[PDB]
Design goal:
Number of helices of chain A: 2
CATH topology of chain A: SH3 type barrels
Structural class of chain A: alpha+beta
Oligomer: 3 chains of a larger assembly
Family (chain C): Belongs to the HDGF family.
Organism (chain C): Homo sapiens
Number of strands of chain A: 5
Strand order of the largest sheet of chain A: 4-3-2-1-5
Largest sheet of chain A: 5 strands, antiparallel
Protein name (chain C): Hepatoma-derived growth factor-related protein 2
Radius of gyration of chain A: 11 Å
Subcellular location (chain C): Nucleus; Cytoplasm
PDB class: protein binding
């Protein structure tokens, strides 16, 4: 399963696969923290892609607000308090 | 003295082929598409459309309302006039 | 959508724009009139024959009306 601190790209409708982590929720959903925007959501595993596996496909800069900062955070300090 | 443009500033915005149009400097939601360098996201009242414009096309509302703040035949213009005067900071989406 | 398919393509800050099909689940888009290219997802794309009644109307934006002429008369 996914555990708190696992790094992912998380997919929501209308947005690119977004650098995120599992934070420490409805059944079979996880608390997601989105890097860059510092937003939260509850997502299921269908929308959760392991970071290391998928970073070559999903980890490329784009024009969305918060995305490029999100990429910096997941690479450089993924476990910090962003609150 | 004037500052640079910021989200929430009210303007008349000038697009080619259109009258100076009531508008605001929009905010950019988290996750949303950012403007190009030196451009602002402009939300046009009435039509509710967004374009990216530089300051050459942006006329401060308080200064220019006497000149441009007048009914126009164009689709959405008069609704735009109501919005800029009465609820310019509201959610229109 | 397939290479050559005619569409209206929507980018933030622009009207629905005559274009053709030429980064995960993005299509290469060629915009008529301006002759620029972008990558766009299927959500931003609208089949030309299906939606021309709606979006095939003149616009004062630079290159748009030239774009409309190309999509109807010389799309390839």
């Amino acid at each position: 399963a996914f555990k708190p601190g696992d790094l992912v790209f998380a997919k929501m409708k209308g947005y690119p696969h977004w650098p995120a982590r599992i934070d420490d929720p409805p059944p079979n959903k996880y608390p997601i923290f989105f890097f860059g925007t510092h937003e939260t959501a509850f997502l299921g595993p269908k929308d959760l892609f392991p970071y290391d596996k998928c970073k070559d496909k999903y980890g490329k800069p784009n024009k969305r607000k918060g995305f490029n900062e999100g990429l910096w955070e997941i690479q450089n300090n993924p476990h910090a308090s962003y609150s």
